[PDB]
């Protein structure tokens, strides 16, 4: 009807046992995008690692894929505190209280217009979520947000396309009309995904031995007395980098050291040419932030990879050249035990064979992939972080953790598509066979509803001593952290990630 | 199953080419002086976007040409052929791993 | 006891809170990350119902003479108390307590 709601409103969060679930609403502004049209986009040589095919669509699309869209600061704080893990179960979406607006300035209702959802259940569309885009939900209810345009990428050569090149149309799909009365609503079940290590480990990988018991294997010690010779000593408690291990440091892919002193940092442009990068079909793309490694090693917080962190932008923070007083630097130093240094080569290996003429050489290993035996942690996630990936339907993967954090998923949360259905405006009366492009000028707005029902690990630790626990600053400040301004601008002053209880290896 | 399919897509081109990014990347480090500039990975910069996701392992092979006068004049066959090595002996790693011809 | 009177509660009538649900003006055809701020002019009217129900305590009183009570006075005035006045507005001309009758110590 169209003077009843077809829904309430629903931001909560239930924690009940090894289960919380996060509910979130907002309001949402959809407008024509494209003049209802698809549109070919593309890049030619900007530079070759730039170029792209693909086509805008004038169909919008509902992102939820960030933590602070169902998570207050508040409820992260909760989770980060308190459970070793994390992971979400199912998922409820709901589109409603839909209100189609015509504007000629003057804004009336369009009591019979409809919008246009569906989602993208089997995955046959191109998969946009997981690319930390901007459209997500906002952290703060109270916002009103603009739902971002659906467009993607096929393959090109330069700005043209190739005969694989995709073209689709989201008109084929079946879709659910609503008009003002209507509201769209389905549900998700997530796979079995892996809890998330919502903790830092408290023993190191090459500390794992009793500091007071040698060892009953011998390691070469000495090879000269001087003369050649051969000692063999156990392994010990001071011998501590020459002990018999079990386990490796996960891998490495080098990335640029780059200090937040920038007196420190080489007098050059080096984001580009020193940045590390993967090459795919003779494009350069920046391996950002790559594998998972730690960002910094002990008292070294102000050197970070130089693509290698999930890198914030602080609120009201430009788009292009942010200083950085206005980002918010993420670090993966917790994965120290565990993960080498993103900065720092992997080892030292074995160049040539020795002899007594030639003295032994060593290679500095600066990318290693995956050696039995190898441990590592994922990158962590953020409040302000991707929550899912997309695995990429492929042959083979190998440990198929989104790099930029969160859960991999073969098959995510389906992309859920809307559109303002096309009003046209008065057709001639004499009969045009031409498609029609004049249409009464239109959006629509809404409230849109997800619930997450996230299962939690709980912390079962014999620490003695208490743990780190994310805290606000006691002291005094002009602004409560997390909360608006005088403004009634809601800002999230800081990155917040998860990792601050403790696991032995 | 054998993929018998081609992707329609590339690993590194996986975003929607209208929204950017809310995540940052070192996009310059000079004014000249020292700095720290932080962009938003977008449409244009898509070279530099965060991505979940990297090209599968390489195992790299050197380059010939159908085109025998683009080729070096030289008998590489072997000597600079793509080996792996195992109790002494090498071997060809062929065809080696997949990658891209 | 509440200091400026009335009934302690540890769990009062709860605070029933209303807003206005914002509706956007028309967004911009391109995508904006910022929250909207342009929205359209609005307000709500409608009726409100609060029922209460009041338990009493009967006065039991063997007192012999007269009680005060609270009474309008009989004499003329230009307004009639706790009614409007010629310009349609309502007003309280005095603060009527509650203890008239008496009861022993």
Partial sequence: ???????????????????????????????????????????????????????????????????????????????????????????????????????????????????????????????????????????????????????????????????????????????????????????????????????????????????????????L????????????????PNTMANQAKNWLPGPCYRQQRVSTTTGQNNNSNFA???????????????????????THKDDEERFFPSNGILIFGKQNAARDNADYSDVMLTSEEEIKTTNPVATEEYGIVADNLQQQNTAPQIGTVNSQGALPGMVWQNRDVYLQGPI??????????????????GFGLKHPPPQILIKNTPVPADPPTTFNQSKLNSFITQYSTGQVSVEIEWELQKENSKRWNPEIQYTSNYYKSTSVDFAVNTEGVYSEPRPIGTRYLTRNL
């Avoid at 003779?282 to 932030?289: F, H, I, K, Q, V």
Wanted: with cysteine.
């Fill in 221 to 236: 010690s000495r090879t000269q007395t001087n003369t050649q010779t051969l000692g063999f000593s156990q392994g010990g």
């Fill in 272 to 294: 580009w040419t020193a940045g590390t990068k993967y090459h795919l079909n003779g494009r350069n793309s920046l391996a950002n932030p790559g594998i998972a490694m730690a």
């Fill in 1 to 219: 009807g169209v003077g009843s709601s077809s829904g309430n409103w629903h931001c909560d969060s239930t924690w009940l046992g090894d289960r919380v679930i996060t509910t979130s609403t907002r309001t949402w502004a959809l407008p024509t995008y494209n003049n209802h049209l698809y549109k070919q986009i593309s890049n030619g040589t900007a530079t070759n690692d730039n170029t792209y095919f693909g086509y805008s669509t004038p169909w919008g699309y509902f992102d939820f894929n960030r933590f602070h869209c169902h998570f207050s600061p508040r409820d992260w704080q909760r989770l980060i505190n308190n459970n070793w893990g994390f992971r979400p179960k199912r998922l409820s979406f709901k589109l409603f209280n839909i209100q189609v607006k015509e504007v000629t300035k003057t804004i009336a209702n369009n009591l019979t217009s409809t919008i246009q959802v569906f989602t993208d259940s089997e995955y046959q569309l191109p998969y946009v979520l997981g690319s930390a885009h901007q459209g997500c939900l906002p952290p703060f209810p109270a916002d009103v947000f603009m739902i971002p345009q659906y467009g993607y990428l096929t393959l090109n050569n330069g700005s043209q396309a190739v005969g694989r090149s995709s073209f689709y149309c989201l008109e084929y799909f079946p879709s659910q009309m609503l008009r003002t009365g209507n509201n769209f609503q389905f549900t998700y079940t997530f796979e079995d995904v892996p809890f998330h290590s919502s903790y830092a480990h408290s023993q190191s990988l090459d500390r794992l031995m009793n500091p007071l018991i040698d060892q009953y294997l011998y390691y």
């Fill in 388 to 405: 899912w990936a997309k695995i990429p339907h492929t042959d083979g993967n190998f440990h198929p953790s989104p790099l930029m954090g």
